[PDB]
Structure 1
Amino acid sequence: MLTDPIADMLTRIRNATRVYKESTEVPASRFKEEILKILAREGFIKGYERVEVDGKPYLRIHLKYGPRRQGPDPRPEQVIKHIRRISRPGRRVYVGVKEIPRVRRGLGIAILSTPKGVLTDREARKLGVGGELICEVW
């Protein structure tokens, strides 16, 4: 039994990418599905599409990387070099609007969860709201 539904996903994407898999599956759910909507509009992952496996819903996240490199260790740079969880369970981290994070000096987002859908540091600030700081990706 999972303890933190999201964190699970984030990680499942994290390791997934470290071994360069083409895409990984993760338990479906509105939220996660809305959380991946961002990683997708933002370029960290080609995309996700509702899929079934054994009979239970899952989400196929098609990871995105870069080009192969020159010299030793030719593996492709990472698109999601880092993807942490901020607001863990039993640690709820909600930030005001003036408390929203800047994240990797604009090189990365920070998915918030404001009472106005799931937005990113940008949007959320643009709309003028704050809320549970779900994660930080770069």
Structure 2
Amino acid sequence: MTDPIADMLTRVRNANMVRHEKLELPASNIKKEIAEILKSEGFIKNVEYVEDDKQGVLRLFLKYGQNDERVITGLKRISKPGLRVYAKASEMPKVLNGLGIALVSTSEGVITDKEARKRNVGGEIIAYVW
């Protein structure tokens, strides 16, 4: 339980393998950031925040689209305690030529892969969710 989000990350794609949703998951202050900034793009049925203390409970409720097909086709974290890879906000890579998105913490608040390119802010840029 040392990474409070770790498996939970790909549990999106390892829960919606056949587009399925029966998986309730635990919280963070970034499990108040992991599932809250891609609803910016209509990606979740509901994660509004975690409503408990002690980093509790949360319905994952992963929105699925109109072609029936994996909203999250595949997904990896490349940022875990035990894998610390820190880069700048300039050559943040091209996430499938920009087809994917990133949602991550920065060195000046909280941003996305829509901010690093136009704000020069960020630290351990995390993943490629698609």
TM-score, length-scaled by structure 1? 0.77
State the one-letter code of the partner of 1:130. Answer: G
* Partner-residue secondary structure (3-state), 1:107: coil
**For residues 31-64 of structure 1, what are the alpha-carbon distances to aligned partners after superposition, in whole Å with 9 as ceiling and x for unaligned?**
1211211222123323314357xxx821112111
Match of 1:63 in 2: 62
Q: What runs of 5+ residues in structure 1 fail to find an aligned partner?
A: 69-75
Match of 2:114 in 1: 122
Larger radius of gyration: 1
**Equivalent-residue separation in structure 2 for 1:116 and 1:23 (angstroms):** 36
- Tell me, yes or no, if structure 1 residue 95 matches structure 2 residue 94: no
**For residues 83-133 of structure 1, what are the alpha-carbon distances to aligned partners after superposition, in whole Å with 9 as ceiling and x for unaligned?**
210112222111102231221222211223212233211112222213112
* Partner-residue secondary structure (3-state), 1:10: helix
**Equivalent-residue separation in structure 2 for 1:119 and 1:62 (angstroms):** 23
Change (3 A) 1:15 1:23: same
Q: What runs of 5+ residues in structure 2 fail to find an aligned partner?
A: none
After superposing on structure 2, the runs of 4+ consecutive aligned residues of structure 1 that deviate more than 3 Å are 49-52
Percent identity, aligned pairs only, is 57
- Tell me, yes or no, if structure 1 residue 17 matches structure 2 residue 16: yes
Q: Which has the higher contact order (CA 8 A, sep 6+)?
A: 2
Q: Which moved more, 1:59-68 or 1:89-98?
A: 59-68
For residue 23 of structure 1, report the CA deviation from its aligned partner.
Answer: 5.3
State the one-letter code of the partner of 1:90. Answer: G
Change (3 A) 1:108 1:43: farther
In the TM superposition, 1:22-61 aligns within 5 A as 22=21, 24-49=23-48, 50=50, 57-61=56-60
TM-score, length-scaled by structure 2? 0.81
**For residues 9-28 of structure 1, what are the alpha-carbon distances to aligned partners after superposition, in whole Å with 9 as ceiling and x for unaligned?**
21222211113223532111
State the one-letter code of the partner of 1:22. Answer: E
State the one-letter code of the partner of 1:86. Answer: I
